[PDB]
């Protein structure tokens, strides 16, 4: 259970980073208009 | 109970990050006007 919750932290962190990065490129596209 | 509260921290953190990211793109849209 400890391992499962800790890899849950891992995947939450990586997907949060991905979401922030996607929105970064999205605002870049918005300002490129 | 410890596991439940700690995953509550996890979901609070990820949804807070999502809210900040959404407002980031919102201000980008506002300034794009």
UniProtKB/Swiss-Prot annotation, chains A, B:
It is found in: Virion. Homododecamer. Interacts with the Cargo protein 1. Interacts with the major capsid protein. Forms the portal vertex of the capsid. Probably involved in head assembly, genome packaging, tail attachment, and genome ejection. This is Portal protein. The lineage of its organism: Viruses, Duplodnaviria, Heunggongvirae, Uroviricota, Caudoviricetes. The chain holds residues 707 to 739 of 806 of the full protein.
């Amino acid at each position: 259970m400890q391992q499962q919750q800790k890899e849950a932290e891992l995947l939450q962190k990586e997907e949060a980073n991905i979401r922030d990065n996607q929105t970064k490129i999205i605002i870049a596209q918005i300002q490129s208009e």
